[PDB]
Write a protein that binds this ligand. Structure first.
Ligand code: HEM
Ligand SMILES: O=C(CCCCn1ccnc1)N[C@@H](Cc1ccccc1)C(=O)O
Length: 451
């Protein structure tokens, strides 16, 4: 099988010692094709980029979720929360079973009011900008998505629109995520040069644990019965085991949700708005839908469901720049991938989602183009062609949450503002564990529609 250039004993590892590893891997996939082996010291994985192979990798009878090295490092603070759990860990299925009703379309109806609360704050923020002011899009999207998950997750107001300095939890979570990402490119991770990084990581873990544990303890102590994820986790019983999540796992779930609803979800909005302002006809069609559907000062859940084209904009943004750009699988047994590449039990696969989503055999030669209309009919999209939310039982539990939040907010943004790519912004995708259009800025001229 193909493999990119190697650096002696470091194998391919230095290829990921780059500011933009996902984009680096995409370029490697561009050159090497649908599958390449990627070796690092004591690690081998295969990056899959074609729907042809990924549809097989998505076969849960043959492949299970693997914790990528990145997820393994995030597990140091997301614990056995859902995204850093192995499927075979008791706490995975337990939490999966308990949390699924909390994340369904039907649950979104109950989160909707809280999402609107934050979305209106975003609108009001942009409504209150002065004429020459501009919007730092990823920053504001993250304010929105963090606040939304804080409010819907555990009735906690990060009040991100009231600050420029991040919440202590977010400082530690961002710095812990950064430490996880840095631990990946390190050729010598045991070197004492990183000893302070390891110590800071420990301090960041303890910070996140303490603040979330206190959030949990505070909720148990107040006895308050909100309808947020925290309440469901405190009160939920896994139908299978009959057991609730323990407080430790609930903390990990909360940390996981905060990670996920932070820049992973804000990236979706950031990229969506990026593609909208880069595609005025798409923007206009999306804004026309927003105006036609969002006839009330506050969007209802039902109206957000009616933002079909906005939904397609988000999918198309997810297609081009999936904010969770890769997921790892391992072969449950010896198997043959694509009739060509024999895998041994335990062999790892990486699904390079942005490259999958550029599979010209699926999307046509207009792959780079932002055409939300690609998603008019999900039935017309081949199986496993579109995997921004991962796969199978290990798919994104937050998908409905992310999409509802994004659709609501994008709908309101499109209703309330005309957007100007006033700097003719050059897409620069900053890579952390997610992707964001770094420095993406717009001007939003209010249509002066009241809320
Ligand atoms: C646009 C936004 C989002 C995207 C693109 C996204 C993407 C993904 C992907 C690709 C996976 C699979 C990871 C893997 O297989 O290793 C995943 C899993 C997961 N996501 Fe998301 N996510 C988003 C937002 C959210 C939100 C808002 C939440 C919760 C508040 C969330 C919670 C989770 C959880 C708990 C899992 C693990 C589910 C399980 O394995 O049982 N995500 N997500
Ligand atoms: O696999 C992940 C981790 C992304 C996890 C997405 N996600 C899901 C839920 N929450 C987040 N990165 C990819 C790409 C990469 C490589 C080196 C450094 C950074 C990134 C890989 O390791 O090859």
């Amino acid at each position: 099988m193909p493999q990119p250039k190697t650096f002696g004993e470091l194998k391919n590892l230095p290829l990921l010692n780059t500011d933009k590893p996902v984009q680096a891997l995409m370029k490697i996939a561009d050159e090497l094709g649908e599958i390449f082996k990627f070796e690092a010291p004591g690690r081998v994985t295969r990056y899959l980029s074609s729907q042809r192979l990924i549809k097989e990798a998505c076969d849960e009878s043959r492949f299970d979720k693997n914790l990528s090295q990145a997820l393994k490092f995030v597990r140091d603070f997301a614990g056995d929360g859902l995204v850093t759990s192995w499927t075979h860990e008791k706490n995975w299925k337990k939490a999966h079973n308990i949390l699924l009703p909390s994340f369904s379309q039907q649950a979104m109806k109950g989160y909707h009011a809280m999402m609107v609360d934050i979305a209106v704050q975003l609108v009001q923020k942009w409504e209150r900008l002065n004429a020459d002011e501009h919007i730092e899009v990823p920053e504001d999207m993250t304010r929105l998505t963090l606040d939304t998950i804080g409010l819907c997750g555990f009735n906690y107001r990060f009040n991100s629109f009231y600050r420029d300095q991040p919440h202590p939890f977010i400082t530690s979570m961002v710095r812990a995520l950064d430490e996880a990402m840095n631990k990946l490119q390190r050729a010598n991770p045991d070197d004492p040069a990183y000893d302070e990084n390891k110590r800071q990581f420990q301090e960041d873990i303890k910070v996140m644990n303490d603040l979330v544990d206190k959030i949990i303890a505070d909720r148990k102590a107040s006895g308050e019965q909100s309808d947020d994820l925290l309440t469901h986790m405190l009160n939920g019983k896994d139908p299978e085991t009959g057991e609730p999540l323990d407080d430790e796992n609930i903390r990990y779930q909360i940390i996981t949700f905060l990670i996920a609803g932070h820049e992973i979800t804000s990236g979706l909005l950031s990229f969506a708005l990026y593609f909208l302002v880069k595609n005025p006809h798409v923007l206009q069609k999306a804004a026309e839908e927003a105006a036609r559907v969002l006839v009330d000062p506050v969007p209802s859940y039902k109206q957000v469901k009616q933002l079909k084209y906005v939904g397609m904009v988000l999918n198309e943004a997810l297609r081009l720049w999936p904010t969770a750009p890769a997921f790892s699988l391992y072969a449950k047994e010896d198997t043959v991938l694509g009739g060509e590449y024999p895998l041994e039990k335990g062999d790892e696969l990486m699904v390079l989602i942005p490259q999958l989503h550029r599979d010209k055999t699926i999307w046509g030669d207009d792959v780079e183009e932002f055409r939300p209309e690609r998603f008019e009919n999900p039935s017309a999209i081949p199986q496993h062609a579109f995997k921004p939310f991962g796969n199978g039982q290990r798919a994104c539990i937050g998908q409905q949450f992310a999409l509802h939040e994004a659709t609501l907010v994008l709908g309101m943004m499109l209703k309330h503002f005309d957007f100007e790519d006033h700097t003719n912004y050059e897409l620069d995708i900053k890579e952390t564990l997610t992707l964001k259009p770094e420095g993406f800025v717009v001007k939003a001229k209010s249509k002066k529609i009241p809320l």
